[PDB]
Amino acid sequence: GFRALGPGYLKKFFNTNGIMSFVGIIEFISELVKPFALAFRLFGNIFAGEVLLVVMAFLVPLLLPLPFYGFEVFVGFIQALIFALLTYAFLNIAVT
Amino acid sequence: PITNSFVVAIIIDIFVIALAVAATRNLQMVPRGLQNVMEFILESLYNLFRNINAKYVATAFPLVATIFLFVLFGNWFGLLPGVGSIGVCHHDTCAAQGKKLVPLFRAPAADLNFTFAIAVISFVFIEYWGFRALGPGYLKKFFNTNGIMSFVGIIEFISELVKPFALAFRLFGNIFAGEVLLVVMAFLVPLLLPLPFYGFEVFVGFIQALIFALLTYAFLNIAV
C-alpha cells in the first residue's frame, strides 16, 4: 500500500476539512486492529476445537464426536480459506 | 373532604359549560369564531366516530365528547402557569409554618380518583352495548367450539376488561409524568431549558385526549 497509491494515506492519516478527519483516525485504528484480530481468530478457532474434541473424548468417548470431528475439519478448512481471502481483500482495499 | 384536583376538575367543567353556553347563545349558519371552532371539532370527532363505527357513532357520542373535552382542559391546565407554584399551606414561599405547600391547582387526570371514573364509565358502556345486541354471545367463550375457543375467549375477555383500566392508568401516568417532567425541568434550569419538553407536553396531551375517544369508539365497534 505504500508502493502503490503513493505514501499519502491522507484518507486514513489526516484530513483538512469535513468529517474525513474523524473517519481517518477510525480507519487507522481498524487497520492496526486487523492483524491482532486475524491472529486471535485463527488461534482461537483451532485451540477451542482441540479443547472441544479432547473434552468430548472425555465424556461418552465413543461414536458421539463423529459429526463434531467432521465439523472441526470443516472449521479448519474454512479458517484456512478465510485467512487467505481476508489477507487478499485487505490488500485490495488498501490498494483502493 | 375535597382535594386540590377536585377544584381544578370543577374549574375545567365550568369552563366547558361556559364555552358551550357561549357557542349556543348565538347559533347561526356559517359560524365564524369560537362557535365555528367548536362545530369543526365536533364534526371532525363525528367523522372519526363514523370511520370507526357509524352505527354507534352517535350512540355514546356525548359521553366521549365530554370525556375528551375534560381531558383537553386538564392537559391545558397542567402546563398553565400557577399550577404547582401557589401553595395553600394546608427556599419555598410557604417555608414558614411548613405544611407541604399543597398546590392550589392539581390536574384532574393526575389523580387516581377522577381517572378511575372514566374507566368505570367506559367499561360499563362497552359491556352494556355489547350485551344489549349479543346477550350471552358478548361474553361467550365458545367452549370447545372453535377448537376449544373457550381459552381464546377467556384471555380476550380479560384483556377487554383490563382495557378501560389500562386507558385510565395511561391517562393518569401521562398527566403525572408531564407534571414531573415540568418540575424536573424547573430544577434543572430556571428558564428557557424546559421549552422542548413543555411544547411537546401539550401535543402529547391533545394526542392522548383524541386517543381516549378513538379507543372508546373502537372498543365499542369491537363490542358491537
Binding site: - | 375535597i2 365530554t66 380518583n113 377522577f114 364509565i121
Partner: protein, 51 residues
C-alpha cells in the same frame, strides 16, 4: 388510596355536563339537520326545475 368524595364530585359534574350536552346536542343536531336539508331540498329542486 382514593378519595370517596372525589369520585362523587367527578361523577355528579360529569353527569350534569352530559345532560347539558344532550340538550346542547339538539343544537348540533339542528345544525347538521340544516346542512343535510340543503342537499335534501336541492336533490328534488334541481330535477323539478329541469323537468
Amino acid at each position: 388510596g382514593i378519595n370517596p368524595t372525589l369520585f362523587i364530585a367527578q361523577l355528579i359534574n360529569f353527569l350534569l355536563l352530559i345532560f347539558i350536552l344532550r340538550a346542547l346536542l339538539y343544537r348540533p343536531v339542528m345544525n347538521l339537520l340544516n346542512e343535510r336539508t340543503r342537499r335534501i331540498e336541492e336533490s328534488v329542486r334541481d330535477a323539478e326545475k329541469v323537468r
